[PDB]
DNA sequence: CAAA
DNA sequence: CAAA
DNA sequence: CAAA
DNA sequence: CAAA
């Protein structure tokens, strides 16, 4: 039980590097 | 050793009583597996007012591979890189029916056997009374409707009703008599074995409840059961939102909304094996048809009212039925109590005018009134029995909207290591 | 809890090579086992005087009656005084022939399971070389002369020639290549799977070792593991005795007879089950008959004398055979050795003359040349190969006696409890 | 290992009672 | 981001 | 939870 | 030895 | 005993 008021769920973000893509990609 | 971020979040939803997955996790031997999961739960809009707070129930087990595909799997490990492919198992050709497993029903209408299996064994183990029928289903396509959806039913709030004695309970143990004589020496015998008997049906149905008897102990691969990792629960309450124009004026909607935490502590992961965290979301069983047995029995005895002790301790349980619980109580059945059972619990009261009021979460009608004269039916909780209470189950009863924040600590290679050949 | 004191000696003998049961105790889920065995150890009269001492093992495992008896036990115990009685194993009509299991043929002709079982299991998950045939006999009638009086036969200790590379061992790993090309990428994955074959092949043929590989654990209740509780050694010695009479003057017999200690730490019996304590007693396979691997090859090549490190590493297994180890070595026993490996290991010398000479524990004939072109018949201890060196086997080769000091904590009614009715 | 020089074994002797038989017996 |  |  |  |  957590006495706060409902907030929103943000990014679903660590370890080492997961995408290679060939170069930066925003 | 390194870090590997499974944290996740997830949007979830399901009926009253029913016991679902909401997020399972593959492990591998070796993996050290921590699970922070945070969120809101909520239940679809209300008719009326808040009434009562729902007991929301969360649990992680942790259920080896091995438990699943048996020795099957022994060898699928010990043959290694040769090992024959791990068979998947069956679900019916609709997406939502893998929902109890926390899963789309995939591309090819299959998903694997730990899934399934391990829902299986947590509800067998755990959520079904000893003395039910044990689940046995083989495939996800040997599940109905609603139970593949939503998960199976659980067991209401314990109470007089809900949670009587085995049925099969003992009522009287009957002895071998000579026709003049009896042997006072085999009498004795005789007690110490109905003891022995009634210990089990009591409390030591399962294997390990017998052993843990002894003073003894039972590994979770003995009776292959999965490991209960963490528990943890909570009531969910929230708020009215009041009514504002010419006929809402005065009128008000309850949006039950209750955050939560659901922590799992640093745990070793022994063998390759799946972490399933289920969630469980009841309503006490309140209802304005039930009153206290003493109020419902019409030849009150000094074995009722009295409560002489000398007596509470040496009767044979009592043979009563929903009848005598309830106004419009099922005579049909049958629940063994323990005798002045009566005088150790008190019933909640709910006046009758709230009898047909829509939008409490109250049993408006005696437990299993519409299942039939079966006791366990009449146990298990009902979903239906609140399809009265919510303006608009267009999410289901209840939902929920959590984040899963998961670190594990494994030997996994770079994902640079795996690209790179050289 | 109580102290349950079941000390008891015991007299015993067996062949060499064979493990024999020597002390077996019935325990119960809550019992606190404490066992401290003492006592001396010798050989029958040998020929001449004392060569070598011989290498006493002694070990004590616990083994849940549940491994034994399987689900039909968990019923047993689950059913409580109803459970069907469990079921009792056959054994030859002969007194001895139940010895491997440390007991004397019952009226009955048939002993409990849990005795033959837990001796099989104990042999098959520690004695028996991994790539060895499992033994499976279902009864102690199944089992041969020898055998059933003697126990079964383990291994010779671990020398170039009875450890060798599992039998199976792969000695090149084909891939596929197309025509004029090959994937070199592919030929990558092709080691690495490679690899995992060969982690397998050469030291992960069990289901725990693998698993254990990934850095993880098993219960021994996993892969049904008898538990090895205690496990203590010993070398036997003894002394001469001198010759007095007019033709025996100058001459001696060795009388082995070592005393010895076997102490089991205080131990926690969580399920029914056996403590079960057997020895093993062996003799260095020294051979007249045996010579260097180097001074066995025709044609000395740099691979070999060089001992080059590079090469060391990267070279497959050498297939070699027993002909290339002793003079009379068996040519159709083929052994996988590593590369090299006669740098890495010196064997023992003795002077031919002792060839022929009755009375020296040696193999006075090359390992298994009576067994034939079959190498597991070789490496295991075949005892007759010592009858030659003793006087009179009238206590087969070895014998000994000593006291087992046992003290047993447990829930246990006193006798005056279980006499007296009132 | 233990060094002495072999020595006879002696009574198989503790808990509770066990052996009732209607008084003393040597 | 060569978690080179 | 044997409130053994 | 009432391990009463 | 992966002398991983
Ligand atoms: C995040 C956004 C960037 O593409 C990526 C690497 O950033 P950097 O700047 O190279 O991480
Ligand atoms: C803790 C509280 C947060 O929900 C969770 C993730 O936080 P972040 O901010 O995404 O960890
Ligand atoms: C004890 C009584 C409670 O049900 C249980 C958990 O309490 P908490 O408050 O969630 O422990
Ligand atoms: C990591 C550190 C520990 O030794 C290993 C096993 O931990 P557990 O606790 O048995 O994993
Ligand atoms: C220790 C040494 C002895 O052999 C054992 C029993 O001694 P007691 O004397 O019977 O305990
Ligand atoms: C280490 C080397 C020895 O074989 C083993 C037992 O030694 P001890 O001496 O019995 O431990
Ligand atoms: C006795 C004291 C201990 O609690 C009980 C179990 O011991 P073990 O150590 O798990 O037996
Ligand atoms: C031992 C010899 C005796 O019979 C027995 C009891 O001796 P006490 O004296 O009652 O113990
Ligand atoms: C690690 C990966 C490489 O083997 C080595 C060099 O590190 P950096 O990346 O230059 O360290
Ligand atoms: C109380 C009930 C029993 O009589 C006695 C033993 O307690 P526990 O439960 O072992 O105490
Ligand atoms: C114990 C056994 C009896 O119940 C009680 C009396 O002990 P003594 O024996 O008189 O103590
Ligand atoms: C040495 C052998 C391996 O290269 C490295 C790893 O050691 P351990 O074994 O995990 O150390």
């Given at each position: 039980?957590?006495?706060?008021?409902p907030?929103?769920?943000?990014?679903?973000?660590?370890?080492?590097?997961?995408?290679?893509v060939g170069?930066?990609?925003? | 050793?390194?870090?590997?971020?499974?944290?996740?979040?997830?949007?979830?939803?399901?009926?009253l009583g029913?016991?679902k997955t909401?997020?399972?996790?593959?492990?591998?031997?070796?993996?050290?597996?921590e699970?922070?999961?945070?969120?809101?739960?909520?239940?679809?809009?209300?008719?009326?007012?808040?009434?009562?707070?729902?007991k929301?129930?969360?649990?992680?087990?942790?259920?080896?591979?091995?438990?699943?595909?048996?020795?099957?799997w022994?060898?699928?490990?010990?043959?290694?890189?040769?090992?024959?492919?791990?068979?998947?198992?069956?679900?019916?050709?609709?997406?939502?029916?893998?929902?109890?497993?926390?899963?789309?029903?995939?591309?090819?209408?299959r998903?694997?056997?730990?899934?399934?299996?391990?829902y299986?064994?947590?509800?067998?183990?755990?959520?079904?009374?000893?003395?039910?029928?044990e689940?046995?289903?083989?495939?996800?396509?040997?599940?109905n409707?609603?139970?593949?959806?939503?998960?199976?039913r659980?067991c209401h709030?314990?109470?007089?009703?809900?949670?009587?004695?085995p049925?099969?309970?003992?009522?009287?143990?009957?002895?071998?008599?000579e026709?003049?004589?009896?042997?006072?020496?085999?009498?004795?015998?005789?007690?110490?074995?109905?003891?022995?008997?009634q210990?089990?049906?009591?409390?030591?149905?399962?294997?390990?409840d017998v052993?843990?008897?002894?003073?003894?102990?039972?590994?979770?691969?003995?009776?292959?059961?999965?490991?209960?990792?963490?528990?943890?629960d909570?009531?969910?309450?929230?708020?009215?939102?009041?009514?504002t124009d010419?006929?809402?004026?005065?009128?008000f909607s309850?949006?039950?909304?209750?955050?939560?935490?659901?922590?799992?502590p640093?745990?070793?992961?022994?063998?390759?094996?799946?972490?399933?965290?289920?969630?469980?979301?009841?309503?006490?069983?309140?209802?304005?048809?039930?009153?206290?047995y003493?109020?419902?029995?019409?030849?009150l005895?000094?074995?009722?009212?009295?409560?002489?002790?000398?007596?509470?301790?040496?009767?044979?349980?009592?043979?009563?039925?929903?009848?005598?619980?309830?106004?419009?109580?099922?005579?049909?059945?049958?629940?063994?109590?323990?005798?002045?059972?009566?005088y150790?619990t008190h019933?909640?009261?709910?006046?009758?005018?709230?009898?047909?009021?829509?939008?409490?979460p109250?049993?408006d009608?005696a437990?299993?009134?519409?299942?039939?004269d079966?006791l366990?039916?009449?146990?298990?909780?009902?979903?239906?029995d609140?399809?009265?209470?919510?303006?608009?189950?267009?999410?289901?009863?209840?939902?929920?909207?959590?984040?899963?924040?998961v670190?594990?600590?494994?030997?996994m290679?770079?994902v640079?290591?795996?690209?790179?050949?050289?």
């Amino acid at each position: 039980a957590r006495p706060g008021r409902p907030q929103p769920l943000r990014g679903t973000k660590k370890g080492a590097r997961l995408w290679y893509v060939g170069g930066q990609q925003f | 050793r390194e870090i590997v971020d499974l944290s996740h979040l997830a949007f979830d939803c399901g009926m009253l009583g029913r016991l679902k997955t909401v997020s399972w996790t593959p492990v591998i031997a070796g993996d050290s597996f921590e699970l922070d999961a945070v969120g809101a739960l909520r239940l679809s809009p209300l008719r009326r007012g808040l009434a009562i707070d729902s007991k929301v129930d969360f649990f992680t087990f942790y259920i080896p591979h091995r438990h699943v595909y048996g020795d099957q799997w022994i060898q699928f490990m010990r043959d290694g890189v040769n090992a024959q492919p791990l068979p998947s198992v069956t679900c019916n050709r609709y997406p939502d029916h893998a929902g109890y497993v926390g899963t789309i029903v995939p591309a090819n209408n299959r998903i694997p056997k730990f899934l399934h299996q391990s829902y299986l064994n947590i509800y067998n183990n755990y959520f079904r009374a000893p003395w039910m029928p044990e689940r046995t289903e083989a495939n996800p396509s040997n599940l109905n409707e609603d139970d593949a959806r939503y998960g199976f039913r659980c067991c209401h709030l314990k109470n007089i009703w809900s949670a009587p004695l085995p049925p099969e309970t003992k009522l009287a143990e009957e002895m071998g008599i000579e026709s003049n004589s009896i042997d006072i020496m085999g009498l004795q015998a005789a007690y110490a074995q109905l003891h022995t008997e009634q210990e089990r049906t009591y409390f030591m149905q399962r294997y390990r409840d017998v052993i843990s008897s002894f003073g003894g102990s039972t590994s979770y691969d003995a009776d292959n059961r999965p490991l209960l990792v963490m528990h943890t629960d909570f009531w969910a309450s929230g708020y009215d939102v009041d009514g504002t124009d010419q006929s809402s004026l005065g009128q008000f909607s309850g949006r039950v909304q209750q955050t939560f935490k659901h922590s799992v502590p640093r745990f070793f992961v022994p063998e390759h094996g799946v972490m399933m965290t289920l969630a469980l979301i009841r309503f006490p069983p309140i209802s304005p048809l039930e009153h206290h047995y003493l109020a419902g029995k019409s030849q009150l005895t000094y074995t009722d009212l009295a409560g002489d002790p000398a007596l509470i301790g040496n009767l044979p349980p009592r043979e009563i039925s929903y009848r005598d619980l309830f106004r419009d109580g099922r005579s049909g059945i049958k629940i063994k109590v323990a005798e002045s059972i009566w005088y150790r619990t008190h019933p909640d009261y709910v006046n009758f005018k709230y009898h047909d009021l829509h939008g409490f979460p109250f049993l408006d009608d005696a437990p299993g009134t519409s299942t039939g004269d079966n006791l366990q039916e009449a146990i298990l909780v009902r979903h239906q029995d609140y399809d009265a209470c919510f303006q608009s189950q267009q999410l289901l009863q209840w939902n929920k909207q959590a984040r899963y924040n998961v670190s594990v600590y494994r030997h996994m290679p770079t994902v640079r290591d795996s690209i790179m050949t050289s």
